[PDB]
Design a protein around this ligand. Structure first.
Ligand SMILES: *[C@@H]1O[C@H](CO)[C@@H](O)[C@H](O)[C@H]1NC(C)=O
Ligand SMILES: *[C@@H]1O[C@H](CO)[C@@H](O)[C@H](O)[C@H]1NC(C)=O
Length: 83
C-alpha cells in the first residue's frame, strides 16, 4: 500500500494533504477543517474565534456543519457568523 511518502501522501495529515503548495505540504482537512488548538497539521475544525458558535444558518440548514466532523456540542457549534 506503501508510500513514496509523497512528499505527503502519508504525511501524517490527520485528514490529508495538498500536497504542498506554498505551504509545501501541510495538512488539509475538509477545508474548513483547520488548525484547531494546536498541531500544525490539524483540523478540529477550523473555528477561528471570537467564537464561531453554533448558530447555523437561516434557511438551508445545510447547517450545523461540523458534524462530520463532530464532536459537537458546545453551542451546537461550529459556524461563525463571525467575520
Ligand atoms: C500548485 O500549483 C500548481 C499550478 O501552479 C498546481 O499543480 C496546483 O494548483 C497546486 N498543486 C497542488 C498541491 O494541488
Ligand atoms: C484561528 O485562530 C486560532 C487561535 O486563535 C488558530 O487555530 C488559527 O490561527 C486560526 N484558525 C484556526 C483553524 O483556528
Amino acid at each position: 500500500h506503501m508510500e513514496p511518502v509523497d512528499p505527503c501522501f502519508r504525511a501524517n495529515c490527520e485528514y490529508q494533504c495538498q500536497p504542498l503548495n506554498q505551504t509545501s505540504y501541510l495538512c488539509v482537512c475538509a477545508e474548513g477543517f483547520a488548525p484547531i488548538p494546536h498541531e500544525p497539521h490539524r483540523c478540529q475544525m477550523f473555528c477561528n474565534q471570537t467564537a464561531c458558535p453554533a448558530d447555523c444558518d437561516p434557511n438551508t440548514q445545510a447547517s450545523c456543519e461540523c458534524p462530520e466532523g463532530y464532536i459537537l456540542d458546545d453551542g451546537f457549534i461550529c459556524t461563525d457568523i463571525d467575520e
